[PDB]
Amino acid sequence: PYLRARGEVFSEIFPIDEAVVRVLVEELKEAFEKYVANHKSLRLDRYQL
Amino acid sequence: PYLRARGEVFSEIFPIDEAVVRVLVEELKEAFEKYVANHKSLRLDRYQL
């Protein structure tokens, strides 16, 4: 007490290869879609995505 | 070192049978299309097809 860290600057990585990102975003989209549809043990908010 | 050389002669020939040129450009782009399909994790910005 009290813990600190001597801070950095933020780690800054930037996207290249973005159409594979487009395929993987629509895969993410259908994936999370059917994830919400399946796992009803989540009781999730269903008005947001 | 260093290097300085002198040239011999010109030699520059061409193919014949331009149908091989046309359909082989098509099959060449087929092969590199398959390699760009393989390029999913190969860090490629995607507008060179």
UniProtKB/TrEMBL annotation, chains A, B:
Residues represented out of the complete protein: 101 to 149 of 793
Entry's induction text: By heat shock.
Protein family: Belongs to the peptidase S16 family.
Subcellular location: Cytoplasm
Name the record gives this protein: Lon protease
Functional description taken from the UniProt entry: ATP-dependent serine protease that mediates the selective degradation of mutant and abnormal proteins as well as certain short-lived regulatory proteins. Required for cellular homeostasis and for survival from DNA damage and developmental changes induced by stress. Degrades polypeptides processively to yield small peptide fragments that are 5 to 10 amino acids long. Binds to DNA in a double-stranded, site-specific manner.
Biological source species: Meiothermus taiwanensis
Record note on quaternary structure: Homohexamer. Organized in a ring with a central cavity.
